Each structure stands twice: as structure tokens, then as C-alpha cells.
Amino acid sequence: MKGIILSGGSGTRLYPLTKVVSKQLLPVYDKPMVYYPLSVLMLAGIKDILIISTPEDTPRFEQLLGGGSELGISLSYAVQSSPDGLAQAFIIGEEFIGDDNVALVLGDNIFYGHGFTELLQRAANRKSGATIFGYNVKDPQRFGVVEFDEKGKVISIEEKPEEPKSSYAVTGLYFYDNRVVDIAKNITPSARGELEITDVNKAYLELGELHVELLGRGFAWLDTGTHESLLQASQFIETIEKRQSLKVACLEEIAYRMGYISREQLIKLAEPLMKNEYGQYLMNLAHRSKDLVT
Numbered sequence: 001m002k003g004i005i006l007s008g009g010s011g012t013r014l015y016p017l018t019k020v021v022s023k024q025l026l027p028v029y030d031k032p033m034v035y036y037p038l039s040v041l042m043l044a045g046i047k048d049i050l051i052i053s054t055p056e057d058t059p060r061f062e063q064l065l066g067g068g069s070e071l072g073i074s075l076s077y078a079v080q081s082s083p084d085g086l087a088q089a090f091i092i093g094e095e096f097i098g099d100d101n102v103a104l105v106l107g108d109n110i111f112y113g114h115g116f117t118e119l120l121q122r123a124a125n126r127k128s129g130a131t132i133f134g135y136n137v138k139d140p141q142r143f144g145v146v147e148f149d150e151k152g153k154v155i156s157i158e159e160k161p162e163e164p165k166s167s168y169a170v171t172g173l174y175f176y177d178n179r180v181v182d183i184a185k186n187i188t189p190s191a192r193g194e195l196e197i198t199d200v201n202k203a204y205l206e207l208g209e210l211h212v213e214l215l216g217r218g219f220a221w222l223d224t225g226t227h228e229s230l231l232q233a234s235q236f237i238e239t240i241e242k243r244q245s246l247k248v249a250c251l252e253e254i255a256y257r258m259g260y261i262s263r264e265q266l267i268k269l270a271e272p273l274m275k276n277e278y279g280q281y282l283m284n285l286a287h288r289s290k291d292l293v294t
């Protein structure tokens with residue numbers, strides 16, 4: 001499975017934060033926002049990942065993350081010249097996808113909770129259809145809204161409905177089989193002038209092949225849409241990390257835990273960062289007994 005992080009857009013709502021910085025390089029507490037959705041794909045077992053951003057910002061993501069070899073993965077980059085919609089990811093990414101199945105995650109979405117990896121790995125395992133993730137939000141009209149029956153079968157999906165049919169938003173993580181690329185080429189722009197992921201999902205729903213995993217109330221799903229919500233997301237991650245000996249979305253740690261890189265390789269990453277707490281954390285992990293790490 002391949003993965004794509006869609007990490008463009010103007011971040012209009014966060015102005016002036018986004019005048020000269022990409023929204024997905026802004027902090028969520030202690031790390032750039034993009035580390036969080038990247039860590040999600042990594043934990044899904046996805047090792048071939050394309051990062052899409054603006055003509056100005058794409059070089060900066062590449063400066064941040066590099067080609068992935070440090071992390072035992074492959075990262076590639078592509079430019080979206082104008083933010084013409086989520087579903088344009090599969091058009092830009094057509095050559096990258098090839099014949100493979102693909103997951104899309106939004107560069108501004110933060111998922112957190114116990115058992116998430118197991119849901120991701122199950123979605124990544126599922127060779128046919130589309131899997132989307134529903135979450136009970138306060139204002140479902142702000143999002144895509146998925147309506148499901150008593151067995152969790154999808155009945156409808158609607159982008160920002162005036163009268164929502166459920167309280168479950170469609171979060172910014174989507175798993176598709178290879179049909180998605182041709183689907184994306186055949187949808188047309190909405191009233192807001194975008195190629196809509198909801199219309200990709202509706203194509204799968206027409207075929208009876210849209211599947212929803214519901215993320216229950218024990219999961220946290222944030223987006224970093226506004227100044228307020230961004231600060232809230234930071235506060236949430238700070239609470240979790242302050243209490244624990246473990247970090248969230250520490251990419252090098254995940255590379256090591258997933259066996260993508262060795263203890264020796266992790267030491268080599270930690271060395272030039274020993275001047276800071278992040279390096280120290282990595283070095284403590286690399287020297288930790290292999291039994292304790294398991």
C-alpha cells in the first residue's frame with residue numbers, strides 16, 4: 001500500500017501564521033503538525049509515501065523530512081499548483097500510485113488513541129473498496145457526514161449537509177483500492193470549486209463498496225483549523241506527553257519500534273540531537289533493553 005499526505009492549501013483561516021509558514025509546519029505542542037499524520041501512515045505499515053504541497057512549501061517539507069532513508073522508508077514529493085480539492089491528490093499522485101492501493105491522510109489531521117494502529121493495519125489489509133473513519137463531533141454540518149445502519153453499513157454520505165443525517169463526521173484519513181485514481185478523474189467540481197473526497201466516497205457507495213470504521217469516544221480526532229483549535233490540540237498533546245515517559249508521533253522512535261531502522265542507526269540519528277531533549281529521548285530509547293522496548 002502506498003500513502004499520500006495532502007499538505008497544501010493556503011491556511012487562510014490561520015492568517016497571519018500562514019503568511020510565510022505552511023500550516024502543516026506549525027507546532028502541535030512540540031513537533032511540526034505534519035509529523036502526526038506521517039506517524040499514522042508509518043504505524044499503518046505504509047513505507048512508500050508521497051507528500052503533496054504548494055509550489056512554495058513543498059521544498060520546505062522536503063528540507064524537514066528528506067527522502068525517508070533516515071527512517072527506513074521512502075518519501076517523495078509533488079506540487080499541487082492550486083488547491084483544487086482533496087481528490088486531486090490521486091491525480092497528482094497517479095504515477096506514484098501505479099497499480100497499488102493507496103491511503104490518503106490530510107496533513108492537518110491529528111488522530112490519537114489506544115488501538116488506532118490495529119484499525120489502520122486492518123484498513124491497510126483490506127484489498128477491496130474504500131474505508132473511511134467516522135467520529136462523533138459536535139457540529140457535523142462542518143464536515144462530510146456518514147449515515148450508517150444498525151450493522152454499520154453505510155446508508156449515505158454528504159458533504160457539509162444543512163440537515164445532517166447523523167452526528168458522525170468523515171475524518172481526514174481514507175483508504176482506497178486502485179480504482180480511486182479513475183474515480184478521481186471522473187468527478188467534477190462542487191459549488192465551492194473543488195474535487196471532493198465525498199464524491200470519491202459516493203462513487204464507492206454506489207458500488208456498495210464504501211466501508212466505515214467508527215472511531216469511538218475514547219479516540220481524539222483533532223484538526224488544527226483555527227487559532228483556537230490549534231492551541232487546543234497543542235494543549236492536548238502536552239497533557240499526554242507530560243504525564244508519560246513516551247512521546248506521540250516521534251518519527252525516529254516509530255521507525256525503530258517498527259524495525260525499519262536498527263539500534264545502531266537510531267544512535268546515529270540521536271547523536272546530532274543530543275544538544276536537545278528530543279535527541280536525549282531517542283538515545284534513551286536506543287540504549288533501552290530490547291525486552292523492555294517490546
Ligand SMILES: O=c1ccn([C@@H]2O[C@H](COP(=O)(O)OP(=O)(O)O[C@H]3O[C@H](CO)[C@H](O)[C@H](O)[C@H]3O)[C@@H](O)[C@H]2O)c(=O)[nH]1
Pocket residue numbers: 006007008009010011080082083084085086088106107108109143144145159170171172196197198223225
Ligand atoms: O486542494 C486542496 C484542498 C485542501 N487541502 C488541505 O486539506 C485540508 C482539508 O481541507 P479543509 O480544512 O478545507 O477541509 P474540507 O472542508 O475540504 O473537508 C475535508 O476534510 C474533512 C476532514 O478534516 C472531511 O473529511 C470532509 O468531508 C472533507 O471534504 C486542509 O489542510 C487544506 O489546506 C489541500 O492541501 N489541497
Ligand SMILES: O=c1ccn([C@@H]2O[C@H](COP(=O)(O)OP(=O)(O)OP(=O)(O)O)[C@@H](O)[C@H]2O)c(=O)[nH]1
Pocket residue numbers: 039040043111112113114115116117118247248249250253254257
Ligand atoms: O511508537 C509509537 C506508538 C504509538 N503511537 C501512538 O500512540 C497511540 C496508541 O498507539 P496504539 O495504537 O499502539 O495503542 P496503545 O500504544 O495505547 O496500546 P498498546 O498496543 O501499546 O497496549 C496511537 O495514537 C499511536 O499513533 C506513537 O505515537 N508512537
